[PDB]
Write a protein that binds this DNA or RNA. Structure first.
Ligand SMILES: Nc1ncnc2c1ncn2[C@@H]1O[C@H](COP(=O)(O)OP(=O)(O)O)[C@@H](O)[C@H]1O
Ligand code: ALF
Ligand SMILES: [Mg+2]
Length: 437
DNA sequence: TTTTTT
């Protein structure tokens, strides 16, 4: 039996290995007790996947809510992504008795902001139980899984893979999942395997979950868009053991810089990726490297991304997002980070009167910090000055050069700077004061 | 050079 439901609001932690049944069995047990359950996951493929399965294996077609697709059935169970949950208004888009926060170990801004939202509104919203579920709580390390056998890759094999090689034999038939660190890498591999006579398909953000055949032989080459909560019935998993990290650097040149670099995977990633196999049956995990870095903490850039997301996506004021983030930090058992809430709130509080047209173009482009990018562009346009550079990031200005001249009013560094720079603009000064003190 | 939101 799952974490019992208390009379009044309470927060509980649920730790169980990957494939245990936290996302299906648990909520199914709550529903059977007559409770309305809301399950939040960071992944789109995962959210969508629960639908067909819960129906066939637990006799209940649940509601599915994702940015791209939604399925309303009126059932007592609802599965949604943190993103769609926020976009729907948080704890105001429905009244549930139980809210399960899956993959609560995640350190992506969307999940952070999501969980912070529920921990701040759940009680008042009438929720009596909030469950923080995960197979890899902060501080934990990868341990042996009862359904998974691990076999290291070697220099033997006809398919080059991050230094090592992949024997065709291990993937000739059956169903297998290969994790790559980049999107182009997936397309490269998928193509190569297809040219070898194998049925391979690439998968990542944006692609339809249907590209993954529900049955039959197949080799899915994907990114971390298929790292958690997903069950593709894979006979094995091949891990490149490489991740893409993003950190903020207070370089005072003139302000801060957000750099995205490829680094070796941590413990969270290793267990979750490995966990995509051996789900309800035996499985095999092949890797390139045995080591794994620690987990349980996240960079300050993530906080920055939350405020940016709150402004550009969720119509949240910097102060409002601070109320939600505070709730997250005040909750034990969750990933920790430097308490810079006030610093970031003050920075975004100063970025006023952004150009709507520019924002709607940065969001469409799917940038990491749409708001910051759009604001930098707003300051340039309103200064008759050119952007930091001319790469895709600043395409919203490309059709304006005839009027853009002089130095760029650099507010911060989102990418490479190739034009002349000025650090005397009021906004730049403002941000500097938020840093120095 | 990853994912999630109109
Ligand atoms: N979409 C699915 N298709 C087939 N089997 C599934 C599916 N989803 C879940 N299962 C089965 O139920 C088990 C529990 O899945 P799940 O609740 O998602 O695990 P957890 O949340 O603990 O990672 C899995 O081991 C798997 O065998
Ligand atoms: F939630 Al899991 F494997 F732990 F999908
Ligand atoms: Mg799960």
């Amino acid at each position: 039996s799952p974490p019992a439901v208390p009379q009044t609001f309470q927060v509980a932690h649920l730790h169980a290995p990957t494939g245990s049944g936290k996302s299906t069995k648990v909520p199914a047990a709550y529903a059977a007790q007559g409770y309305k359950v809301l399950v939040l996951n960071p992944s789109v493929a995962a959210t969508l996947g629960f639908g067909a399965y819960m129906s066939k294996a637990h006799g209940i077609d649940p509601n599915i809510r994702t940015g791209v697709r939604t399925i309303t059935t009126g059932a007592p169970i609802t599965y949604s992504t943190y993103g769609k949950f926020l976009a729907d208004g948080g704890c105001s888009g429905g009244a549930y008795d139980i809210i399960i926060c899956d993959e609560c170990h995640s350190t992506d801004s969307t999940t952070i902001l999501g969980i912070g939202t529920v921990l701040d509104q759940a009680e008042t919203a009438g929720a009596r139980l909030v469950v923080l579920a995960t197979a890899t709580p902060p501080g934990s390390v990868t341990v042996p899984h009862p359904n998974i056998e691990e076999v290291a890759l070697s220099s033997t094999g006809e398919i080059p893979f991050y230094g090592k090689a992949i024997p065709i034999e291990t993937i000739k038939g059956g169903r297998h999942l290969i994790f790559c660190h980049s999107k182009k890498k997936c397309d490269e591999l998928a193509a190569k395997l297809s040219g070898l006579g194998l049925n391979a398909v690439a998968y990542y953000r944006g692609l339809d979950v249907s590209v993954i055949p529900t049955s039959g032989d197949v080799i899915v080459v994907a990114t971390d868009a298929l790292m958690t909560g997903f069950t593709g019935d894979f006979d094995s998993v091949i891990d490149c053991n490489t991740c893409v990290t993003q950190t903020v650097d207070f370089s005072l040149d003139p302000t801060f810089t957000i750099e995205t670099t490829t680094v070796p995977q941590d413990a969270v990633s290793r267990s979750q990726r490995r966990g995509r196999t051996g789900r309800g049956r035996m499985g095999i995990y092949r890797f390139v490297t045995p080591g794994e870095r620690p987990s349980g903490m996240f960079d300050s850039s993530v906080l920055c991304e939350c405020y940016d997301a709150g402004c550009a996506w969720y119509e949240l004021t910097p102060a409002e997002t601070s109320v939600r983030l505070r709730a997250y930090l005040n909750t034990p058992g969750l990933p920790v980070c430097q308490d810079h809430l006030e610093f970031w709130e003050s920075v975004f509080t100063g970025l006023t009167h952004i150009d709507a047209h520019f924002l709607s173009q940065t969001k469409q482009a799917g940038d990491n910090f749409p708001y910051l990018v759009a604001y930098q562009a707003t300051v340039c346009a309103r200064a008759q000055a050119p952007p930091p550079s001319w790469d895709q990031m600043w395409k919203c200005l490309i059709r304006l050069k005839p009027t853009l001249h002089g130095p760029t009013p650099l507010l911060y560094r989102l990418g490479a700077v190739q034009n002349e720079v000025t650090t005397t603009h009021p906004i730049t000064k403002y941000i500097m004061a938020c840093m120095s003190a």
